[PDB]
Write a protein that holds these residues in place. Structure first.
Motif, PDB file in Angstrom:
ATOM      1  N   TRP A 108       0.842  -1.188   0.000  1.00 38.09           N
ATOM      2  CA  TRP A 108       0.000   0.000   0.000  1.00 38.09           C
ATOM      3  C   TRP A 108       0.879   1.241   0.000  1.00 38.09           C
ATOM      4  O   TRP A 108       1.825   1.336   0.790  1.00 38.09           O
ATOM      5  N   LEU A 109       0.565   2.183  -0.880  1.00 31.95           N
ATOM      6  CA  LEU A 109       1.305   3.428  -1.009  1.00 31.95           C
ATOM      7  C   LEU A 109       0.577   4.567  -0.303  1.00 31.95           C
ATOM      8  O   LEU A 109      -0.634   4.517  -0.073  1.00 31.95           O
ATOM      9  N   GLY A 110       1.340   5.601   0.041  1.00 32.91           N
ATOM     10  CA  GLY A 110       0.786   6.782   0.672  1.00 32.91           C
ATOM     11  C   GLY A 110       1.775   7.927   0.734  1.00 32.91           C
ATOM     12  O   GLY A 110       2.921   7.742   1.153  1.00 32.91           O
ATOM     13  N   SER A 158       4.570   2.185   2.602  1.00 37.30           N
ATOM     14  CA  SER A 158       5.683   3.107   2.408  1.00 37.30           C
ATOM     15  C   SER A 158       5.166   4.323   1.645  1.00 37.30           C
ATOM     16  O   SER A 158       3.954   4.516   1.499  1.00 37.30           O
ATOM     17  N   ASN A 159       6.092   5.152   1.158  1.00 37.30           N
ATOM     18  CA  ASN A 159       5.745   6.341   0.397  1.00 37.30           C
ATOM     19  C   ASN A 159       6.195   6.298  -1.054  1.00 37.30           C
ATOM     20  O   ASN A 159       5.830   7.197  -1.820  1.00 37.30           O
ATOM     21  N   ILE A 195      -7.503  -4.029  -8.275  1.00 38.60           N
ATOM     22  CA  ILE A 195      -6.300  -4.564  -7.644  1.00 38.60           C
ATOM     23  C   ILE A 195      -5.521  -5.430  -8.623  1.00 38.60           C
ATOM     24  O   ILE A 195      -4.288  -5.353  -8.697  1.00 38.60           O
ATOM     25  N   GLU A 196      -6.221  -6.276  -9.383  1.00 40.38           N
ATOM     26  CA  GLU A 196      -5.542  -7.123 -10.357  1.00 40.38           C
ATOM     27  C   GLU A 196      -4.887  -6.290 -11.452  1.00 40.38           C
ATOM     28  O   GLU A 196      -3.761  -6.582 -11.871  1.00 40.38           O
ATOM     29  N   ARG A 222      -2.222   1.520  -4.748  1.00 43.92           N
ATOM     30  CA  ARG A 222      -1.711   2.879  -4.624  1.00 43.92           C
ATOM     31  C   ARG A 222      -2.848   3.805  -4.218  1.00 43.92           C
ATOM     32  O   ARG A 222      -3.906   3.806  -4.852  1.00 43.92           O
ATOM     33  N   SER A 223      -2.626   4.588  -3.165  1.00 39.12           N
ATOM     34  CA  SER A 223      -3.635   5.523  -2.686  1.00 39.12           C
ATOM     35  C   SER A 223      -3.725   6.733  -3.606  1.00 39.12           C
ATOM     36  O   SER A 223      -2.708   7.254  -4.073  1.00 39.12           O
TER      37      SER A 223
END
Lengths: 856, 129
Positions: free
Chosen positions: A591-593, A667-668, A742-743, A688-689
């Motif tokens: 997961w990104l942020g 992470s970022n 997601i896929e 990815r957010s």
């Protein structure tokens, strides 16, 4: 009972009976079901067929015993020749004694005389009666032991007395409301008892007078061994002259079974009339021992309606099956729990009486000098329901206590097992609770002192109480307490307990008790349970409630957190299944942020809610290389660390390979992958957010709601409810859920990272027809040139790359050629500016957020 | 206690003077095709090894592997792209034999702990890149 032990230790004379039984009488065994036996004792269900010699010795022994006192339960069966056992169930209208006047006795004797005249004739009349003062009033038992006519003539005489009327009017003269039916029709076909033999919970009878007379073939007290005289088998009499077996065996030979039988009377009717409770009871009985069948059929017979209609048959389908194997995680402790729930008072007197009996028999046996072992047994029987002893991995005994409400205790350990360095609770229980039992012993002793007895036994009692008084202080001595707790450790020890702790991942420890996710709906145990729970989370479970302000607050927070709906449902369901401490499906989520997004806040929230025992922080250092820490958890997480993130293929290789936790990284910046094997890739997912929050971000979310119990509770209810929803829907098979976003993101990420997979997707296309057997190292040169045009001008040539491609996603749709070459089939190679042909396959108004459709 | 002293194997389910402390929790029963698991396993093995002689030889080698005595001092190498069942077979045999006689060995030991094999009747490894 305990009274029997008190009387046995009471009497110096009485030893002769059991010495004879053990030494001389023992060799003359008689089968319990056989008719050959003549003397039977129901104390333990023993039958004997002794000759007359030891018969008269035991008669005189019982005579000295009744001279000294005590109580007996001896029985005898009438043979082919016997006297007259007559039992009268004289249930009078009123409990006023009808004194047996000599005229009434004489008239009754003459009446039975003329009954026996019209039969075989070629006499002593002895009279005894109840001590009265009892429902059903007294009874009369006249004996005619002179004659020997035990045959069908006895049945004829019984029938005649059934229709006799003079005895009826004699009873009327005694004020009896039942002229007939007092005679048992099986009077001569059932075993009888000798004088001095009492009934269960009933005193033995007393003799009023014994007369005698003579019968002519033509003309129509304390100076004898009366016990021997009354004997039907006593042919050599002096004054008189000769003119459900398994259930009983189990009850009479097993005290704990007797106590369970006593407490089963306290069970409410619903237990034996409905399948659930009866089945659970028989499961507990099977866990106890398979030898306790007769009590199981007795419990079934407590409900004859169902017992006849397959109740015995279903018990055979249950008790035997359970006997072979019982999967009920239950013991007797559950039975006592139910008994105390339903009949707490009678439960209290029953347990107090049992403890008193144990302590009193120990005191009497050992002259009132106690020791570590007796104290340990008494304390075990008293309070073994909240302590277990098990040896640790280092060889040290470790104590545990079952937490109950109303005691000093930290938040969240309620209805759970907690470890103690020393059994201080036991160490004060032994000092206080046992004192009242010992006081009961003392008052019992002085109660017998108050009764007038024989002087020598009284001196015995003073010595006994003096010794017990000397034994008072040792209940307080610290070293004695240490010895006692050592004995308890060797008693309370339960083999194979530590390694069984927290084994089932269907149980999680919460603040308000214990919750089980075994089936839908989930049951939150808020009471005592055999379940052993040590690990737990401070968070207390809350019944899921949609209308709660914090519930809708978190619903809105999640809805704003994820702009997508279906992907939100997928990730939400996945994190809901992350609670499962068992074997997961071995997936990884990235997961990104960019900051000020709350994804770190979600990670912190879930970590705090789940607690340390099931969630632990994981460092990027381990993956880029404490590895033993992540085992045993249910969820793992990471934190954002700079922008130079990189992995090690081997580490994730054993990560994507025991493991029973959930792994999520945050992470970022986009992670750097350096692998092509499908074994790695198939266990990887990425997201990815998109939305960012700025000063709209809520500082209370990161500060107040981050540590607000209500939010966490509401969150816990949300996640458990969604676990239940998925289990109803997908039965835990998360892979069935469709996540197109997601896929797609994972495919794009793999194309970005896995250059080989990108080439496979772009320049390798499966033709709908034809063959691609031409695929050889020419394809290797093709993707080498592609790398020159894509990543690196360096010539990439290695057959092991083809081998791992076979190990890669290209494993399917393959074939082993007769020459075993890396030849494809139905495929084509896309050169520069070459286009794949057609058919070339590539190689809700916010109520859904609360609960979406199973088929959205 | 199962003894392979003399054919046929005899399971002492009663008193015996043989001193043993190590064990595997698996219980023994005489083999028979009647068990659906038996036929399923044999068909799976036949699918795994289409060849006859090689299958028989390797199965015999695994049969000898249970012997904690001296062996012929031989090494067996097996290759497969992955998820082909060879991993399934090695996991199955490792689980059946148990810790006391079977142990996984890291590739680091061979590529360069080595005494941990003492007391084992069978050792193995796993794929590492």
């Amino acid at each position: 009972t305990i009274q029997l032990t008190a009387q046995r230790k009471y009497l110096a004379e009485v030893q002769a009976l059991e010495t004879l039984l053990t030494r001389e009488l023992s060799v003359f065994l008689t089968e319990p079901g056989s008719k050959k036996t003549n003397i039977i004792n129901r104390i333990t269900g023993k039958t004997y067929a002794l000759p007359s010699t030891e018969l008269l010795r035991l008669y005189e022994h019982l005579e000295q015993c009744r001279k000294q006192g005590a109580l007996m339960y001896f029985l005898e069966r009438q043979g082919t020749y016997s006297g007259l056992m007559l039992d009268y169930d004289l249930k009078l209208n009123t409990n006023a004694v009808p004194p047996l006047e000599p005229p009434a006795l004489s008239r009754l004797c003459h009446r039975i005389f003329v009954h026996i005249k019209n039969s075989s004739v070629l006499i002593h009349f002895f009279f005894t009666l109840k001590p009265e003062v009892v429902q059903g009033k007294y009874g009369f038992h006249v004996l005619i032991p002179g004659l020997k006519l035990a045959a069908s003539t006895k049945k004829s005489i019984i029938g005649s007395l059934q229709h006799d009327a003079t005895v009826q009017k004699i009873l009327h003269e005694q004020g009896v409301t039942n002229p007939e039916s007092c005679l048992d029709p099986h009077s001569a076909s059932v075993p009888s008892l000798l004088y001095g033999s009492s009934k269960l919970n009933h005193k033995p009878y007393q003799l009023k007078t014994g007369f005698e007379l003579v019968f002519d073939s033509s003309d129509p007290l304390e100076s004898y061994n009366l016990v021997s005289e009354l004997s039907l088998t006593n042919e050599q009499g002096s004054l008189v002259r000769p003119v459900d077996h398994s259930l009983s065996i189990l009850m009479l030979h097993d005290p704990e079974a007797r106590y369970l039988h006593k407490i089963l009377n306290l069970l409410p009717p619903e237990y034996y009339v409905e399948y659930p409770l009866w089945s659970n009871v028989v499961f507990a009985l099977a866990n106890t021992s398979a030898n306790y069948r007769p009590l199981a059929e007795w419990f079934s017979q407590k409900c004859p309606e169902k017992w006849n209609t397959g109740g015995k048959e279903k018990l055979e389908k249950l008790w035997n099956d359970a006997s072979h194997h019982t999967e009920k995680k239950i013991t007797k402790r559950s039975i006592m729990y139910w008994a105390h729930k339903h009949a707490p008072q009678q439960y209290k007197e029953i347990v107090e009486q049992g403890y008193f009996s144990i302590l009193a028999e120990y005191v009497y046996s050992y002259n009132g000098m106690l020791e570590h072992y007796m104290i340990a047994k008494v304390i075990y029987a008293m309070m073994g329901n909240k302590f277990v002893v098990d040896v640790d991995s280092n060889g040290k005994y470790v104590w545990f206590e079952f937490v109950l409400p109303g005691q000093p205790m930290n938040q969240g350990e309620i209805w759970k097992w907690r470890k103690e360095v020393n059994p201080d609770e036991l160490h004060i229980y032994i000092s206080e609770n046992f004192s009242r039992v010992m006081d009961r012993i003392t008052e019992h002793i002085k109660y017998h002192l108050s009764q007038p007895h024989e002087s020598n036994i009284l001196n015995y009692y003073k010595k006994l109480l003096k010794a017990f008084e000397r034994s008072k202080s040792k209940i307080f001595n610290d070293s004695f307490k240490k010895g006692v707790i050592r004995q308890a450790e060797f008693l309370f020890r339960q083999r194979s307990f530590i390694q069984t702790l927290d084994t089932n991942p269907h149980l999680l420890g919460v603040g308000n008790g214990v919750l089980s996710i075994e089936t839908i709906p989930a049951k939150l145990i808020n009471h005592f349970h055999e379940h052993p729970i040590h690990q737990y989370t401070h968070i207390c479970y809350v019944p899921f409630n949609p209308e709660n302000p914090w519930t809708k607050l978190l619903l809105n927070a999640l809805q704003d957190i994820i702009p997508e709906l279906d992907a939100r449902l997928w990730i939400m369901f996945y994190l809901s299944t992350a609670i499962f401490r068992g074997l997961k499906e071995a997936l990884m989520l990235l997961w990104l942020g960019g900051g000020c997004n709350g994804k770190t806040f979600l990670m912190r929230l879930v970590a705090m809610v789940l607690g340390d025992h099931y969630a632990s922080k994981l460092n990027i250092s381990l993956l880029t290389s404490a590895f033993m820490r992540l085992k045993g958890r249910g969820y793992g997480y990471f934190e954002e660390t700079n922008k130079s993130e990189v992995l090690n293929t081997s580490r994730l290789k054993e990560m994507v390979n025991q493991m029973t936790a959930t792994m999520v990284a945050a992470s970022n910046y986009n992670f750097i992958i350096d692998t092509t094997d499908h074994g790695t890739w198939r266990r990887l997912r990425h997201y990815r957010s998109k939305v960012k929050f700025c000063h709209k971000e809520d500082p209370r979310f990161i500060h107040e709601y981050i540590m607000d119990p209500d939010c966490q509770n509401a969150f816990f209810s949300i996640l458990v409810y969604f676990w239940e929803k998925l289990q109803k829907e997908y039965n835990g098979q998360i892979k069935k859920v469709f996540c197109p976003t997601i896929e797609s993101e994972t495919e794009a990420y793999r194309k970005s990272q896995d250059t080989l997979h990108r080439f496979i997707t772009e320049r390798v296309v499966e033709s709908p027809s034809a063959e691609t057997v031409y695929n050889l190292s020419e394809v290797v040169t093709a993707y080498a040139e592609w790398y020159n045009t894509n990543i690196n001008v360096k010539r990439h040539i290695a057959l092991e790359l083809s081998q791992e491609l076979e190990n890669s996603v290209l494993e399917k749709y393959l074939q082993w050629s007769p020459n075993k070459t890396r030849i494809l089939k139905g495929c084509r190679i896309l050169h520069k500016f070459e286009t794949l042909q057609p058919g070339e396959s590539y190689i809700e108004p916010k109520n859904k957020w609360w609960e979406w459709s199973p088929n959205p």
